[PDB]
Amino acid sequence: SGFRKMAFPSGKVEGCMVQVTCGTTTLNGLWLDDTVYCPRHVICTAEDMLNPNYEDLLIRKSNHSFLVQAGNVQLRVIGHSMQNCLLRLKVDTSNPKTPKYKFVRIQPGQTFSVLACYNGSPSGVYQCAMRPNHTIKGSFLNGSCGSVGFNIDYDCVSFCYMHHMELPTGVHAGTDLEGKFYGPFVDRQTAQAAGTDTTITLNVLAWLYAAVINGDRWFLNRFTTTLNDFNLVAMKYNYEPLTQDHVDILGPLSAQTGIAVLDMCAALKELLQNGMNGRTILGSTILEDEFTPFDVVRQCSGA
Amino acid sequence: SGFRKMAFPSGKVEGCMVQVTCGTTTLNGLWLDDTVYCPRHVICTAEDMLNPNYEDLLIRKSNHSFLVQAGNVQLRVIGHSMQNCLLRLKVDTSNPKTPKYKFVRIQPGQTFSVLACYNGSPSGVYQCAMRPNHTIKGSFLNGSCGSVGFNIDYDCVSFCYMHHMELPTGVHAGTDLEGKFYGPFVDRQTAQAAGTDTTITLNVLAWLYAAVINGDRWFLNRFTTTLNDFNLVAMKYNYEPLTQDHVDILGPLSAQTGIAVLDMCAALKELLQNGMNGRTILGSTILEDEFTPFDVVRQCSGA
Numbered sequence: 143s144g145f146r147k148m149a150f151p152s153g154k155v156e157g158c159m160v161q162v163t164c165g166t167t168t169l170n171g172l173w174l175d176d177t178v179y180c181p182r183h184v185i186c187t188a189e190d191m192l193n194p195n196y197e198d199l200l201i202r203k204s205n206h207s208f209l210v211q212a213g214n215v216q217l218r219v220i221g222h223s224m225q226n227c228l229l230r231l232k233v234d235t236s237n238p239k240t241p242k243y244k245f246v247r248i249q250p251g252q253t254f255s256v257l258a259c260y261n262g263s264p265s266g267v268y269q270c271a272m273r274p275n276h277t278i279k280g281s282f283l284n285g286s287c288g289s290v291g292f293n294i295d296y297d298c299v300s301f302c303y304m305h306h307m308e309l310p311t312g313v314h315a316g317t318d319l320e321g322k323f324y325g326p327f328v329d330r331q332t333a334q335a336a337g338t339d340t341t342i343t344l345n346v347l348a349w350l351y352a353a354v355i356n357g358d359r360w361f362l363n364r365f366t367t368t369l370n371d372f373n374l375v376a377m378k379y380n381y382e383p384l385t386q387d388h389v390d391i392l393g394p395l396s397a398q399t400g401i402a403v404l405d406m407c408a409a410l411k412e413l414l415q416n417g418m419n420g421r422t423i424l425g426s427t428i429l430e431d432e433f434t435p436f437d438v439v440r441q442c443s444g445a
Numbered sequence: 446s447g448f449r450k451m452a453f454p455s456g457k458v459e460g461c462m463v464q465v466t467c468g469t470t471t472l473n474g475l476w477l478d479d480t481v482y483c484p485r486h487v488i489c490t491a492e493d494m495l496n497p498n499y500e501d502l503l504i505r506k507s508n509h510s511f512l513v514q515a516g517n518v519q520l521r522v523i524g525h526s527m528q529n530c531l532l533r534l535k536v537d538t539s540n541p542k543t544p545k546y547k548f549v550r551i552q553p554g555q556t557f558s559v560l561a562c563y564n565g566s567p568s569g570v571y572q573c574a575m576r577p578n579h580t581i582k583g584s585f586l587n588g589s590c591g592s593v594g595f596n597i598d599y600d601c602v603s604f605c606y607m608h609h610m611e612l613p614t615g616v617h618a619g620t621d622l623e624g625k626f627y628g629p630f631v632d633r634q635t636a637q638a639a640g641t642d643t644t645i646t647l648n649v650l651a652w653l654y655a656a657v658i659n660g661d662r663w664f665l666n667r668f669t670t671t672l673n674d675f676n677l678v679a680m681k682y683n684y685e686p687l688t689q690d691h692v693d694i695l696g697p698l699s700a701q702t703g704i705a706v707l708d709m710c711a712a713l714k715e716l717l718q719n720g721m722n723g724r725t726i727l728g729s730t731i732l733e734d735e736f737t738p739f740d741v742v743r744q745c746s747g748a
């Protein structure tokens with residue numbers, strides 16, 4: 143019993159974290175096989191950040207310009223190149239702790255674990271969602287760039303996020319591991335801002351199923367709804383429209399609990415319109431949207 | 446920026462987790478140097494759980510009765526003994542991944558990370574508090590016994606919890622790593638129940654300081670209070686009394702933010718009496734009590 147925001151164990155990722163220094167700037171990199179990946183902004187002076195020509199800035203850098211440390215062991219850089227917003231530093235040693243891995247680009251609404259790191263040293267782990275506006279509501283301080291986000295599936299690590307910057311509202315932006323940003327953001331000094339965000343409807347419905355599995359049932363009613371009529375209430379309360387794909391994804395949780403997807407939608411509609419009337423759901427007074435259907439099933443497991 | 450429930454990176458602990466089997470029962474153990482620690486109930490049949498004489502049950506067990514696996518490598522048991530509610534299984538191999546470590550008994554209100562494990566394989570990590578009633582509100586399924594809780598301080602792992610059981614209300618009980626239970630609980634079948642719990646006042650005040658550091662200030666007022674007058678409101682709303690020790694602990698956060706401890710107490714008193722009036726604090730509508738002052742300082746870091 144119980145339901146917690148839960149992160150993947152971080153060890154397989156800790157074994158890949160290194161410190162990358164270029165001049166006075168230090169941040170983190172990810173060492174997989176004989177390559178270290180890190181944000182390309184590591185090569186920039188403060189002045190360069192205002193209008194960087196990264197191609198031209200990189201050409202003036204030498205392999206010797208980069209100091210890479212794995213723990214207390216220096217790794218010699220033998221090649222450097224750029225891939226989108228990442229630097230790929232080829233090194234003289236293949237990481238013996240490289241896990242089975244994949245690079246994946248995740249979709250808005252999906253969740254992942256973040257291993258916050260400073261100076262190549264892991265400091266904490268937490269679970270996030272990629273928001274509809276392509277930011278994450280993380281916890282990052284200066285020095286955290288190059289920290290990564292990931293999921294783990296049967297000992298295979300799917301890396302999905304590398305941290306590049308904080309935005310003025312204090313939320314966070316980065317790239318996939320091919321170096322393409324999530325969202326319209328750019329790695330240079332501009333007035334860019336996160337767009338308006340939305341609540342992740344599918345995740346809220348998942349979390350209601352989790353509540354039911356854990357014994358909180360008070361919000362279930364005898365009301366019914368159609369997809370159209372639900373989406374009218376979603377729109378008013380700044381929720382994403384529910385789609386048929388979303389309904390299908392909720393099939394397994396619906397079958398386990400015996401509550402029809404549209405019946406849970408009727409429960410959510412009443413929660414939106416009326417509040418909780420002094421009650422809690424899994425100890426929350428807010429409707430949580432950072433658990434996916436997969437997270438619920440994984441954590442509540444079998445029987 | 447940002448403030449998240451954050452766990453310690455779990456790698457140093459993952460390297461210590463093993464699977465312990467006795468007959469048809471499998472659970473987890475912690476392998477440090479040449480010893481594996483696990484809950485003593487691993488030796489029990491279902492029938493034994495009703496009235497176990499552990500001393501007598503253990504004497505009939507052989508070193509050969511225990512199957513211990515670290516990953517896919519079998520570790521041979523060369524001695525067995527009991528320490529309070531734990532078994533200590535001496536093994537033929539010292540764990541080469543044993544970190545610097547200490548065993549500590551934590552106090553109610555303090556937080557720690559839990560590495561949930563099944564069949565000796567880590568599955569997830571999350572942050573908990575030891576509740577005033579000596580339980581934890583964890584997320585554990587059958588098979589999770591022997592999962593551990595810990596903190597990390599400069600590469601030293603302080604182990605503080607080993608999981609033994611779930612209680613009827615769905616909260617969780619266990620021991621320190623000397624095998625002494627937290628709370629009045631026992632490792633046998635009885636009608637034992639968690640006692641009434643209380644909100645951890647010191648932690649709520651910490652989390653309000655974290656909000657201020659992150660830019661949420663709306664709850665600050667011009668009101669003042671005394672410790673006595675605050676404790677009257679604490680008592681009514683089922684909060685722990687604030688003590689002078691608690692006030693002293695909040696010194697650093699008070700100095701950083703410039704808000705006097707008793708002035709934050711006046712802010713909390715109004716929040717308790719009046720609600721939020723449609724506002725949130727760090728995205729919460731509830732007053733969070735599972736961050737200690739140390740957690741706030743660690744996560745918000747320096748400047």
Ligand SMILES: CCC(C)(C)NC(=O)[C@@H](c1cccn1C)N(C(=O)Cn1nnc2ccccc21)c1ccc(NC(C)=O)cc1
Pocket residue numbers: 167183186187188191282283284285286287306307308309310328329330331332446
């Ligand atoms: C957080 C404050 C603002 C909104 C102003 N943004 C930046 O400072 C940003 C940036 C400044 C100029 C361009 N960008 C993208 N940046 C980081 O966010 C970096 N960052 N990432 N996570 C952070 C968390 C807290 C603070 C800064 C953080 C950053 C990145 C690289 C540099 N490099 C050099 C040489 O100055 C400086 C700042």
Ligand SMILES: CCC(C)(C)NC(=O)[C@@H](c1cccn1C)N(C(=O)Cn1nnc2ccccc21)c1ccc(NC(C)=O)cc1
Pocket residue numbers: 143470486489490491494585586587588589590609610611612613631632633634635
């Ligand atoms: C969770 C349900 C109840 C409240 C009935 N308690 C137990 O089953 C308990 C227990 C049963 C009898 C004595 N105790 C302490 N126990 C575990 O909790 C175990 N446990 N720990 N975390 C759990 C999470 C979910 C379910 C069980 C969990 C447990 C421990 C060992 C056994 N051993 C054998 C041979 O039967 C059986 C049950």
